[PDB]
Amino acid sequence: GSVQIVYKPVDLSKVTSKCGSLGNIHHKPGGGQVEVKSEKLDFKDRVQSKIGSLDNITHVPGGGNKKIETHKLTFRE
Amino acid sequence: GSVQIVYKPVDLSKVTSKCGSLGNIHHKPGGGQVEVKSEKLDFKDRVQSKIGSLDNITHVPGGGNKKIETHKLTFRE
Amino acid sequence: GSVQIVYKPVDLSKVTSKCGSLGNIHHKPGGGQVEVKSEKLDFKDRVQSKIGSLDNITHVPGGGNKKIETHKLTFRE
Amino acid sequence: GSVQIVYKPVDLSKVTSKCGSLGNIHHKPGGGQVEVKSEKLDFKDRVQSKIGSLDNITHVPGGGNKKIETHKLTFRE
Amino acid sequence: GSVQIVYKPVDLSKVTSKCGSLGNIHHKPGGGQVEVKSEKLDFKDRVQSKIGSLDNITHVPGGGNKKIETHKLTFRE
Amino acid sequence: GSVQIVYKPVDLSKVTSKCGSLGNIHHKPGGGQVEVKSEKLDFKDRVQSKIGSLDNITHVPGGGNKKIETHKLTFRE
Amino acid sequence: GSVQIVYKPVDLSKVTSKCGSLGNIHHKPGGGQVEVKSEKLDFKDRVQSKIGSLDNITHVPGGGNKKIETHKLTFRE
Amino acid sequence: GSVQIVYKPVDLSKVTSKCGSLGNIHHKPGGGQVEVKSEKLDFKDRVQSKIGSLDNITHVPGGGNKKIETHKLTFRE
Amino acid sequence: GSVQIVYKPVDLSKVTSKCGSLGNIHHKPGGGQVEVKSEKLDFKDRVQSKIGSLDNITHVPGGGNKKIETHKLTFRE
Amino acid sequence: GSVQIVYKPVDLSKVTSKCGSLGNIHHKPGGGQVEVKSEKLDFKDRVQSKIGSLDNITHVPGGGNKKIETHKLTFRE
């Protein structure tokens, strides 16, 4: 029993953007107050906890085009 | 018993955008107050917890076109 | 018993957008107050919890076109 | 017993939009107050809980065209 | 039983962006206050905890185009 | 014409209060938002204006007994 | 014409208070946002204006007994 | 015409307070945001203006008994 | 015409307070943000302006008893 | 015309306070941000301006009893 597998995907996609002028952005967060209480904490795996945070993020990219592509081939016998 | 598999998808997609002028954005969060109470915490897996947060995000991309593409081929015997 | 499988999908889709001028956006959240109480917490899987949050998000992309495409081929014997 | 399978879908769809001018958007949330009480919490699966939140989202994309396409081929013997 | 596997995906994708002028960005976070209490902490895995943080991030890239591509081939006998 | 005026009021009043125990008071205002617009403003007298305010007052006195007493004698000829 | 005026008011008032125990007071204002617009402002007298304020006052006196007493005698000829 | 004026008010008032124990007071203001706009400002008198303020006052006196007493005698001819 | 004026007020008032124990006071202001705009400012009198302030005051006196007393005698001819 | 004026007020007032123990005071201001804009400023009188300030005051006196007393006698002819 012969098994033949051909895996030749083709991609020619394009992801572009144009923006003539970009600016004049104001970000003025007005403070705040946060309080958290805990006693026991157990993390044993791929964990990404985030406890008691006060964050401000100003994200202004001229591009920001995102492309994700995943290929997977599994063979079992 | 011979098995033949051909896997040749073709992609020529395009994802574009045009924006002549972009700006004059005002973000003024007015504070706040948050309180959380816990005692026991057990995370053992692919967890993404987020406890007691006060966040402000200003996200202004000139592009921001997103493309996700996944291929998968599983063979069992 | 010979088995022949041909998998050649074709895609030429396009997802575009045009916007001559974009701006003059005001975001003024007026604070707030949130309180949460818990004692026992067990997360063991692909969990995405989010407890006790006060968030403001200003999302202004000039593009923002999203395309998701998934292919899957499973063979069993 | 020979089995022949041909899988060649064709797509040439387009999803576009035009907007000459876009702006002058005001978002003024007037605060609030939320309180939640719990003691036992067990999440063991693909869960997406969200407990005790006060959120404001201002989403203004110049594009925002969304396209989702999924292909699946299952073979059993 | 001979097994032949051909794995020749082709990629010619492009991810570009143009932005004529970009600037005039103001980020003025107004302080804050955060307090966290815990006693026991056990992390034994790929953990990425983050406890009690007050962060401000100003992220302004002229490019910022992101591309992620993963290939995987598993053979079992 | 002789005029005789005798002005001898007598006061022995008492204003007391007793409170054995006083406490456990919670004041949690949930933010808000107020906007006022004006152009011309003229105040020329004993004025006590108050324009565009967002106030929270927590007033807990153990005493708080108030006594006001005014005497006035006017003579004309 | 002889005029005789006697002005001998008597006061023996008392204003007291007792409070055995006083405490456990929580004041947690949740932020806010206020905006005022004006162009012309003229104050020429005993004025006590207050424009565009965001105030929190926690007033806890153990006493706080207030007494106001005014005497006035006017003679004209 | 002889004029005789006798002005002998008597005061023996007392203003006291007792408080056995006083404490455990929490004041946690959660930020905020205030904006004021003006162009012309003229104050020529006993004025007490206060423009664009964000204040927090924690006033805890063990006493705090206030007494105001004013005497006035005006003679005209 | 002889004029006789006798001005002998008597005061024996007392203003006291007792507080056995006083403490455990927490003051935690959570920041904020204030902005004021003006161009013309004219103050020519007993003025007490206060423009664009962010203040926190923690006032804890063990005493704090206040007494104000004013006498005035005006004679005209 | 002889004029006789006798001005002999008597004061024996007392203003006291007792506080057995006083302490354990925490003052933790969480920053902030204030901005003021002006161009013309004219002060010609008894003025007490205060522009663009960020102040924290911790005032803890063991005494703090205040007494104000003013006498005035005006004679005209």
mmCIF file with all atom_site columns, C-alpha atoms in Angstrom, chain C residues 28 30 33 35, chain F residues 28-29 32-33:
data_model
loop_
_atom_site.group_PDB
_atom_site.id
_atom_site.type_symbol
_atom_site.label_atom_id
_atom_site.label_alt_id
_atom_site.label_comp_id
_atom_site.label_asym_id
_atom_site.label_entity_id
_atom_site.label_seq_id
_atom_site.pdbx_PDB_ins_code
_atom_site.Cartn_x
_atom_site.Cartn_y
_atom_site.Cartn_z
_atom_site.occupancy
_atom_site.B_iso_or_equiv
_atom_site.pdbx_formal_charge
_atom_site.auth_seq_id
_atom_site.auth_comp_id
_atom_site.auth_asym_id
_atom_site.auth_atom_id
_atom_site.pdbx_PDB_model_num
ATOM 1 C CA . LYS C 1 28 ? -15.223 61.229 27.329 1.00 0.00 ? 28 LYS C CA 1
ATOM 2 C CA . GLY C 1 30 ? -17.340 59.674 33.094 1.00 0.00 ? 30 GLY C CA 1
ATOM 3 C CA . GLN C 1 33 ? -17.306 52.240 40.382 1.00 0.00 ? 33 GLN C CA 1
ATOM 4 C CA . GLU C 1 35 ? -16.888 45.918 43.219 1.00 0.00 ? 35 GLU C CA 1
ATOM 5 C CA . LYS F 1 28 ? -19.615 55.355 47.390 1.00 0.00 ? 28 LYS F CA 1
ATOM 6 C CA . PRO F 1 29 ? -20.547 57.907 44.726 1.00 0.00 ? 29 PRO F CA 1
ATOM 7 C CA . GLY F 1 32 ? -20.960 61.363 36.680 1.00 0.00 ? 32 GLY F CA 1
ATOM 8 C CA . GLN F 1 33 ? -20.650 63.995 33.981 1.00 0.00 ? 33 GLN F CA 1
#
